[PDB]
Amino acid sequence: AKLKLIKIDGSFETEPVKLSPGLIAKELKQQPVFDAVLVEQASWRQGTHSIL
RNA sequence: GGAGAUGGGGAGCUGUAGCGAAAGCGAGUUUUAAAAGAGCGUUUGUUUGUUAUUAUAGACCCGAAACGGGUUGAGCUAGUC
């Protein structure tokens, strides 16, 4: 993928860069991502909610 | 490790060949003298999320005279001193 590099001032560099495979997929799936975000919201409770 | 996903940790479980109680045998096993017959065979996947049902935990919930253990009780009242 074609990318650019920025500096501390806030200006782009003068040389782009490509990216080799390793994080680019050809498949599609959202239900895995759906349960991923759901379990991300999980592990946040601590059982404080309780009554007699 | 923000008590996180995750990474590591393959301990174990499913199916991968089964027959029966077994010595054991094995695409055959056991019953039988049977190579007769019959049975079972003759791979057809795993883990989660979810829904419903079922199993135990009070398990839709309300309800009794119940039972057991402990405890206050002679000033009402019974008897006695």
Measured over the CA atoms of residue A22, residue A26, residue A27 and residue A32, the dihedral's sign is positive
Q: Is A46 helix (H, G, I), strand (E, B) or coil?
A: coil
The string over A4-13, giving b where at least 16 C-beta atoms fall within 10 Å of a residue's C-beta and e elsewhere, is: eeeeeeeeee
Nucleotide lying nearest to A31, CA to C1' measure: B49
Is any atom of strand B within 7 angstroms of residue A40's beta carbon? yes
Q: Are A14 and A6 in contact (CB under 8 A)?
A: no
Is any atom of strand B within 7 angstroms of residue A31's beta carbon? no
Phi/psi at A28 (5° precision): -140, 130
Q: Of how many residues is chain A composed?
A: 52
Resolution of this entry, Å: 6.3
Residue A27 CA to residue A33 CA, distance in Å, equals 13
Nucleotide lying nearest to A39, CA to C1' measure: B5
